[PDB]
């Protein structure tokens, strides 16, 4: 799911809606957009 970013990095492919709702934590190459979102989900941005 598409999440809106606090850490609005230069890599705007789309809109402020760039981050994905990642479960628990974040994956390799996925940096914190909105560090915490909901209960057991955080927003991470796949940035190169």
GROMACS .gro file of C-alpha atoms in nm:
model
   48
    1UNK     CA    1   0.000   0.000   0.000
    2UNK     CA    2   0.098   0.356  -0.097
    3UNK     CA    3   0.207   0.581   0.191
    4UNK     CA    4   0.288   0.953   0.203
    5UNK     CA    5   0.642   1.056   0.295
    6UNK     CA    6   0.781   1.279   0.569
    7UNK     CA    7   1.133   1.200   0.440
    8UNK     CA    8   1.045   1.345   0.099
    9UNK     CA    9   1.368   1.244  -0.074
   10UNK     CA   10   1.468   1.378  -0.421
   11UNK     CA   11   1.354   1.058  -0.598
   12UNK     CA   12   0.995   1.169  -0.673
   13UNK     CA   13   0.893   0.915  -0.934
   14UNK     CA   14   0.522   0.983  -0.872
   15UNK     CA   15   0.393   1.219  -0.596
   16UNK     CA   16   0.438   1.254  -0.217
   17UNK     CA   17   0.268   0.911  -0.235
   18UNK     CA   18   0.586   0.714  -0.286
   19UNK     CA   19   0.642   0.507   0.032
   20UNK     CA   20   0.514   0.151   0.082
   21UNK     CA   21   0.363   0.015   0.403
   22UNK     CA   22   0.624  -0.238   0.520
   23UNK     CA   23   0.545  -0.486   0.799
   24UNK     CA   24   0.727  -0.452   1.132
   25UNK     CA   25   1.051  -0.310   0.993
   26UNK     CA   26   1.209  -0.214   0.657
   27UNK     CA   27   1.398  -0.413   0.395
   28UNK     CA   28   1.742  -0.378   0.230
   29UNK     CA   29   1.736  -0.064   0.014
   30UNK     CA   30   1.413   0.055   0.183
   31UNK     CA   31   1.475   0.371   0.386
   32UNK     CA   32   1.232   0.533   0.631
   33UNK     CA   33   0.977   0.769   0.479
   34UNK     CA   34   0.742   0.768   0.779
   35UNK     CA   35   0.937   0.583   1.048
   36UNK     CA   36   0.613   0.473   1.220
   37UNK     CA   37   0.272   0.457   1.051
   38UNK     CA   38   0.026   0.208   1.210
   39UNK     CA   39   0.062  -0.049   1.495
   40UNK     CA   40   0.292  -0.308   1.329
   41UNK     CA   41   0.364  -0.122   1.003
   42UNK     CA   42   0.612   0.147   0.895
   43UNK     CA   43   0.654   0.346   0.571
   44UNK     CA   44   0.965   0.273   0.365
   45UNK     CA   45   1.087   0.408   0.034
   46UNK     CA   46   1.281   0.190  -0.208
   47UNK     CA   47   1.552   0.441  -0.294
   48UNK     CA   48   1.861   0.382  -0.507
   0.00000   0.00000   0.00000
